Amino acid sequence: GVVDILKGAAKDIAGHLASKVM
């Protein structure tokens, strides 16, 4: 699903961003 596929980066905006400061 194009939705579940895009949600892939969504978690990053919350993870990659967090990991960056963590």
| Encoded tokens for 11 | 């978690």
How far apart CA 19 and CA 12 sit, in angstroms, is 9
First to last CA, the chain: 31
Q: By what method was this entry solved?
A: NMR
Alpha helices in 1-22 (DSSP H): 2-21
Q: Which residue has the tokens 């990659």?
A: 16
How far apart CA 4 and CA 1 sit, in angstroms, is 5
How far apart CA 5 and CA 19 sit, in angstroms, is 21
Phi, psi of 4 (to 5 degrees): -60, -30
How far apart CA 21 and CA 12 sit, in angstroms, is 13
| Encoded tokens for 2 | 């194009």
In the three-class reduction of DSSP (H, G, I as helix; E, B as strand; rest coil), residue 16 is classed as: helix
Integer angstrom CA distances of residue 1 from 6, 8, 18: 9, 11, 26
How far apart CA 2 and CA 9 sit, in angstroms, is 12
